[PDB]
Amino acid sequence: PRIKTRRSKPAPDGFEKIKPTLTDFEIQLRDAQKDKSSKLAAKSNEQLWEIMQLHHQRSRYIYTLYYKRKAISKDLYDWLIKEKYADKLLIAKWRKTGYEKLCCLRCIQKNETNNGSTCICRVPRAQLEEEARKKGTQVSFHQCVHCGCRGCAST
């Protein structure tokens, strides 16, 4: 979230109900945002991954309540979007087909990657597993370096 500066009205109707759920998130974030003296690259990456997951989760919760459950007013949702709470682009992506389970947006920036493609997470476990079986080796990848996303795919 951003800081309130009397720009937007404090909150629409149903914020008081959801606020305590997404205020747990804030605590988690706070725990995350600090020097965990990781002393090690992988460990360091893990905290970032965790943070990313947390970010995703809040958005999902919001998204779930507004679209799937539909228990929150449109206005409130809009307000949330305007604030830093939800991710707008991510939500949009989710709403689109084939991107519903989506760890993060930068796992589908095809420009970013060295090989002109999407993140592996986006490959359904099924396909990778099949490939592995064909080869001889076991399941090859666990989670990507952008965000911890073991089997991000929509399956």
Partner 1 sequence: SWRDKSAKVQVKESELPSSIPAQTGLTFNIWYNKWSQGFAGNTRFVSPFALQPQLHSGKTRGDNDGQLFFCLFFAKGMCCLGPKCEYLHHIPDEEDIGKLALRTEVLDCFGREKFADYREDMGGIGSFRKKNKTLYVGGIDGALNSKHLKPAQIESRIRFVFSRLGDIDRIRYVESKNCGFVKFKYQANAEFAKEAMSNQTLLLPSDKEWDDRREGTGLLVKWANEDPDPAAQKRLQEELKLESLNMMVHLI
Partner 2 sequence: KFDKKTKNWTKDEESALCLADFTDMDVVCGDGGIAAILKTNDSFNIVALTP
Partner 3 sequence: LPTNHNKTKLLKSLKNTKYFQQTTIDWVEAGLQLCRQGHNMLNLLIHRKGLTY
Sites of contact with partner 3 (CB under 8 A): 2-3, 84, 106, 109, 111-114
Residue with Cβ nearer partner 2 (111 or 137): 137
For position 107 contacting Zn ion by CB under 5 A, the verdict is: yes
For position 137 contacting partner 2 by CB under 8 A, the verdict is: yes
For position 133 contacting partner 2 by CB under 8 A, the verdict is: yes
Q: How far apart are CA 32 and CA 14, in angstroms?
A: 28
Options 8-16, 94-102, 131-139, 143-151: segment touching partner 2 (CB under 8 A): 131-139
* Shortest separation between residue 53's beta carbon and partner 3, angstroms: 16
| N-term to C-term CA, the chain | 31
- DSSP letters along 39-51, please? -SHHHHHHHHHHH
Q: Which residues contact 125 (CB under 8 A, 6 or more apart)?
A: 139, 151, 153, 155
